[PDB]
Amino acid sequence: PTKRRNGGRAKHGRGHSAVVRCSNCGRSCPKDKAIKRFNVRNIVDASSQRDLREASVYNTYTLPKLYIKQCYCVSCAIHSRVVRVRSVEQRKVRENPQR
Amino acid sequence: GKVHGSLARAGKVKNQTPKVAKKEKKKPPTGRAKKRQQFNRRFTGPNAQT
RNA sequence: GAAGUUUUGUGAACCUUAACACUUAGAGGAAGGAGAAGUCGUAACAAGGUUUCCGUAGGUGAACCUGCGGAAGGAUCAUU
RNA sequence: CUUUGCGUGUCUAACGCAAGGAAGUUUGAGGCAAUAACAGGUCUGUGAUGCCCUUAGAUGUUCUGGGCUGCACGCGCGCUACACUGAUGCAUCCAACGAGUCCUUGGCCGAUAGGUCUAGGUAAUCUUGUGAGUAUGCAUCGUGAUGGGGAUAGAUUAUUGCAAUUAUUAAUCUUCAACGAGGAAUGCCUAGUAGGCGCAAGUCAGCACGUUGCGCCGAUUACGUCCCUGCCCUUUGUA
RNA sequence: AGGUGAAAUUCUUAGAUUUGUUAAAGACGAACUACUGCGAAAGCAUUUGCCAAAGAUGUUUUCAUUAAUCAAGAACGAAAGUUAGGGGCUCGAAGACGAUCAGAUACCGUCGUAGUCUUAACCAUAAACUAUGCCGACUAGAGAUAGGAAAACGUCAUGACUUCUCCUGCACCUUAUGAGAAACCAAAGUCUUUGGGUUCUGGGGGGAGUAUGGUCGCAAGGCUGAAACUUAAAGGAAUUGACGGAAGGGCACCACCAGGCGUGGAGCCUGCGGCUUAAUUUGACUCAACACGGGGAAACUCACCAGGUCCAGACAUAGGA
RNA sequence: UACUGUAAUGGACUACCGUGGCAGUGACGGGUAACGGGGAAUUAGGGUUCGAUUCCGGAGAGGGAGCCUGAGAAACGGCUACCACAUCUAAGGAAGGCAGCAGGCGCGCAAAUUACCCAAUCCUGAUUCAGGGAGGUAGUGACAAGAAAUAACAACCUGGAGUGAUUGGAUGAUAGGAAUCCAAACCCCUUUCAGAGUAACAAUUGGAGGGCAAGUCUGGUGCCAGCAGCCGCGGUAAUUCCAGCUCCAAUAGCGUAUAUUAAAGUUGUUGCAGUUAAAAAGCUCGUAGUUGGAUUUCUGCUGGAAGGCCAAUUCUAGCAUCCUUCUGGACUUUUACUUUGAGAAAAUUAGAGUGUUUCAAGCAGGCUUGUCGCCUUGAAUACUCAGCAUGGAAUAAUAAGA
Which residues is A40 bridged to in the sheet? A67
A91 touches strand E (CB under 7 A): no
What's the distance, CA A87 to chain centroid?
Answer: 21
CB atoms inside a 10 Å sphere around CB B26: 4
Which residues is A39 bridged to in the sheet? A68
The backbone torsions φ and ψ at residue A56, rounded to the nearest 5 degrees and listed phi first, read -80, 165
d(CA B45, CA B38): 14
Which residues is A70 bridged to in the sheet? A37
| Contact call for residues A75 and A54 (beta carbons, < 8 A) | no
The backbone torsions φ and ψ at residue B6, rounded to the nearest 5 degrees and listed phi first, read -80, 150
| Contact call for residues B28 and B34 (beta carbons, < 8 A) | yes
B18: containing domain: 1-50
Chain C: nucleotides under 7 Å from a protein CB? Answer: 34-36, 47, 51, 69-80
Give the list of residues 6+ apart from residue A33 with CB closer than 8 angstroms, or none. A8, A9, A10, A74
Question: How many structural domains comprise chain B?
Answer: 1
Which residues is A38 bridged to in the sheet? A69
A 61-90: CB within 7 Å of strand D: 85-88
Domains assigned to chain A:
1-99 (3.30.1740.20)
